[PDB]
A paper describes a structure:
The majority of m6A sites are mapped within mRNA coding regions, where the modification can modulate codon reading by aminoacyl-tRNA (aa-tRNA) in the A site of the ribosome. Here, we show how m6A modulates decoding in the bacterial translation system using a combination of rapid kinetics, smFRET and single-particle cryo-EM. The mRNA codon adopts a π-stacked codon conformation that is remodeled upon aminoacyl-tRNA binding. m6A does not exclude canonical codon-anticodon geometry, but favors alternative more dynamic conformations that are rejected by the ribosome.
Specifically, 48% (m6AAA), 52% (Am6AA), or 46% (AAm6A) of ribosomes failed to progress from the IC towards decoding and peptide bond formation, compared to only 4% of ICs with unmodified AAA codon. To further elucidate the structural basis of slower translational rates of ribosomes decoding the m6A-modified Lys codon, we separately analyzed ICs from the same datasets and reconstructed maps at 2.4 Å (m6AAA), 2.2 Å (Am6AA), and 2.1 Å (AAm6A) overall resolution. Given that the nucleotides are clearly resolved, the weak density for the modification likely reflects its rotational dynamics. Surprisingly, in all structures the AAA codon was in a π-stacking conformation, which—to our knowledge—was not identified with any other codon sequence in the well-resolved IC structures available so far. Residue A1493 in helix 44 (h44) flips out of its helical arrangement and is involved in stacking with A1 of the AAA codon. The stacking array extends beyond the A-site codon to the next nucleotide (U4) from the downstream codon UUC and with C1397 of 16S rRNA.
Residue numbers in the entry:
A (entry chain c): 1 to 46
B (entry chain A): 2 to 272
Write the structure that this text describes.
RNA sequence: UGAGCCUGUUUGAUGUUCUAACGUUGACCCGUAAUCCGGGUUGCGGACAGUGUCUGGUGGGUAGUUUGACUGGGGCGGUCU
RNA sequence: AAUUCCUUGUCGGGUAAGUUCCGACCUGCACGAAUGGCGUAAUGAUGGCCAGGCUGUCUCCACCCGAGACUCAGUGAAAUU
RNA sequence: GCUCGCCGGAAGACCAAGGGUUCCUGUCCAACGUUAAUCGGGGCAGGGUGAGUCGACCCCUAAGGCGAGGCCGAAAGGCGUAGUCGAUGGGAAACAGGUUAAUAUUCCUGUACUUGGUGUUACUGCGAAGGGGGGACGGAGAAGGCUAUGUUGGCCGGGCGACGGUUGUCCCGGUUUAAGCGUGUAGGCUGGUUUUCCAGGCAAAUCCGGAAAAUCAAGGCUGAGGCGUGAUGACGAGGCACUACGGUGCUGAAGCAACAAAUGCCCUGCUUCCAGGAAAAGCCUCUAAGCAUCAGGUAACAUCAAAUCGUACCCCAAACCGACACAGGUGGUCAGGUAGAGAAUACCAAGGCGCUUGAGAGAACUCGGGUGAAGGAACUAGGCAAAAUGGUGCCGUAACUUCGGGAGAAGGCACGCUGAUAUGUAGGUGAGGUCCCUCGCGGAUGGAGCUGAAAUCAGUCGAAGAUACCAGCUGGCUGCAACUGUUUAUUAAAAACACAGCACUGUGCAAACACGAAAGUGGACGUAUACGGUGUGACGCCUGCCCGGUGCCGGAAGGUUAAUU
RNA sequence: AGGACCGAACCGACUAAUGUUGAAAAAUUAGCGGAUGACUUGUGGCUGGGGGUGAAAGGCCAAUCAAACCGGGAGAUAGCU
């Protein structure tokens, strides 16, 4: 039976990537929050 | 001509067609074409703003001349053509200087005829003049509402307008809805009426025929729930309320026009 | 044409006319290599239309809530000083 | 009657025997004309009833071929208390 | 190693997406593997991916995204012009053989092709951000020409059979060869050349569009296959000498014809229909400002260049999505033999597997199946489940009907093998030989060789000849919805929803209506034979009376009535 | 010619048995409907929560829908256990 997750790298990067986060004011807030918490990986980009 | 189909299938039993043998079988003139994409009834916000639109056949746009400038140069008719964007046929015309154009085809126009525009043209179907120069009591189509703008009235298959009176700088017109209206006497018009008057004698026959033209199904408000329409609900079949639109405005009688800017040009509303 | 002051003046209402505010999703020129925008010339409307503050009507389109107790279960009936 | 409580109404047909079925009567508790009335060839994994052929559905169950259940060696859970 | 069994339009082979060392060699068996393990997609160490021509990058755009100035909005911000991005689409060029434990159109051998820079020589009007051509486009149908590929004969090499026969009308195996270069065929489309003139293509034009004369009747474009060369080459059963068991050196026969034939190619073709079927660049032409000694253009030679990233392995699955070595899900390409209408079904070829606990016994009961005396729905809410019919050709077929249907209505008869008609028929294909002509991939005649249905007559075997797999049960009366379609992912597929048709009502274009504090956008590059809302639901015969109540439309005399004064 | 007929690939889900700490958090085996069209499928794009989309079942919006998920007001309030 078909399931929910169906991968695709182009779509992943266009949806949750670094440049997508930087293009908007709220994405910068996501990045600031994650930097303040101290995560080792900041986005989904390799 | 109008032709009935034979009942070889339940989807063919009720089909009536309009067949015309004089239309061109071939490709249209290329230097007068453009692309046209579909919308689905959606605007730049991405929301449906008009219901029941979607799908259909692919179409290309033909550039038609509604201004009819170029006075003094005769033109000859080359052929008549089918157009998917409107309900009237079009005609290809060639000028004496070597230029080609598309125009609306009136009733009775064949290949090999002549046409002209200007103040000193003749009174025959297909010619264009300002209405200051047309005898009162005449039948016209493709009428302007401002001098130099292009035709905007009586452009559909089989329609026309009547010139009823003239007084000063204005003329009075009777329209297809039954309205009397005023327009400046310096506007332009074409003699005759629009052709393809059998367009209203066709029966589609099956649901796929409407789907071929980009029309989607209509769902009645009485078949919904109360959260979707003011007409929804019930245990069985119940109405018990005055009919309204999906947004709560009464249908079946209430009026809706409100424009004080243009009220000085209407002489009598449609009856 | 109706109201005040010594025919004349002040101020209302009604109806024609005009251009200079204002409108143009008519035509032409430039910025320009551009069916947006601005400026210039010219037609058509014209103190109307439209917007701000105040004010009467309509308004389940949307929102916040009320719809009592006794009772040989509860509702219906009866009752509450 | 996809509508009728009294009701398995009364009469006729089909069965040896028919509260369901088909044709009629009119006493319509409480049908009825675009929240449509009465009909209708073709179409339907749609509701009801009758026939031919066919049979382990049944009187009433008997034998056989394979996979488990049973014994030996290796691994090795669960709800509850 | 020998035997047995299973799949074979897949349970074989090659990819995209996704994963990322799972690939090859040596060594180890604690943990992982539903059991043992000397084995592994497990632990440890080493090795393995070679490009001018395959892809990406690059040139060009679709839907959509961002957007200098600009318009709009308490702030944050929204929409948009000139521009710039974005493939699932358009744009130059390579084939066959050999080789490693693991790579190959990349490495080696042979034979090819494309695009740019520079130099020398010989002729010469070149020049764009602009004008014109081309690229460039739908569904369905028919039949002519071909190839991939198969069967048989001829040829070459081998054989003479564990039990009766087998020197022959016998048995087994092979019979392969590309791109490029020359030739321009079956066939499709279109009349050719010269001169003069002109309100059109923003300006110009020798290019396109238009008009009037003369002249010739043949010019041009497109095009599968075949033939020649490439090839005195490569490959090829087998033989001469040893094996590290992977192989080395050499040698090496035949290598032709007929018939059948695609869903692939000619074909972006041809015929026909209405619902009327992308954009931009690469490419070919035309001139403007400008340069004219120069610069630039066309052709021949010589030389230089073509960088950077991917390339191992799985890919209907034990490596991807499902917590698992999970009976589930996942787009493209290739298509052998016998019987068959067939990509169905049965048995096989190349190729790949027996699904990671076994060994015994032969109780009740549960699961999946085969057979049944006499009866034949008596079972049960209900013929639920099972049993039964099933092919091709011919005969024959009712009420009713919108004249198409109902209809495969119903019910019947024949069907295998051998001989003759005919040592293989009616058809299909087609060599030699003879003539004709511009001489070629030409035309007429001619019939060798090959292939090959269906019917009739006379015989013959069994209980049974559509013998296996495969493969409609049929008739009579009635309710509902006209019909094909749609729906409650995971207890409801229906009489529920939609529908073609009908009627009422709004709407004069800066339309009504809808999304938006606004700017703006859809409706529509449409204009009352058009567009939006509401109810009924093919077709036939029809659709009666009520304006007192609640709504909507028209009126304006009288009563009541806000801010303001 | 045809929202024509029979039937594989492809797309669905009418009946029965098994399974219910399943091989499977919706499947398997034997039958069943459509199959040139209102058909089916690959890659990318747009619509955002009192909002979307809906041939209309209160259906669907990441195993969650008569108002999604995550963080905050927050130790909301609980005459009740």
């Amino acid at each position: 039976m078909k399931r929910t997750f169906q991968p695709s790298v182009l779509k992943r990067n266009r949806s949750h990537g670094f440049r997508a986060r930087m293009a908007t004011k709220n994405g910068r807030q996501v990045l600031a929050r994650r930097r303040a918490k101290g995560r080792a990986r900041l986005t989904v980009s390799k | 001509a109008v032709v009935k189909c034979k009942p070889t299938s339940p989807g063919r039993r009720h089909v009536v067609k309009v067949v015309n043998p004089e239309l061109h079988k071939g490709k249209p003139f290329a230097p007068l074409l453009e692309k046209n994409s579909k919308s689905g009834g959606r605007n730049n916000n991405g929301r449906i703003t008009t219901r029941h639109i979607g799908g259909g056949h692919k179409q290309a746009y033909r550039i038609v001349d509604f201004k009819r400038n170029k006075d003094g140069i005769p033109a000859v008719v080359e052929r008549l053509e089918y157009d998917p964007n409107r309900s009237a046929n079009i005609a290809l015309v060639l000028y004496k200087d070597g230029e080609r154009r598309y125009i609306l085809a009136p009733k009775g126009l064949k290949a090999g005829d002549q046409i002209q525009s200007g103040v000193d043209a003749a009174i025959k179907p297909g010619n264009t003049l300002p209405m200051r120069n047309i005898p009162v009591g005449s039948t016209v189509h493709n009428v302007e509402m401002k001098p130099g703008k292009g035709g905007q009235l009586a452009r559909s298959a089989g329609t026309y307008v009547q010139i009823v009176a003239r007084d000063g700088a204005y003329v009075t017109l009777r329209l297809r809805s039954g309205e009397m209206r005023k327009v400046e006497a310096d506007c332009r018009a074409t003699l005759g009426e629009v052709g393809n008057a059998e367009h209203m004698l066709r029966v589609l026959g099956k649901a796929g025929a409407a789907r071929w033209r980009g029309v989607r199904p209509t769902v009645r408000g009485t078949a919904m729930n109360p959260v979707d329409h003011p007409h929804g609900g019930g245990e069985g079949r119940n109405f018990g309320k005055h009919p309204v639109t999906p947004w709560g405005v009464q249908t079946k009688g209430k009026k809706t026009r409100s424009n004080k800017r243009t009220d000085k040009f209407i002489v009598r509303r449609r009856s």
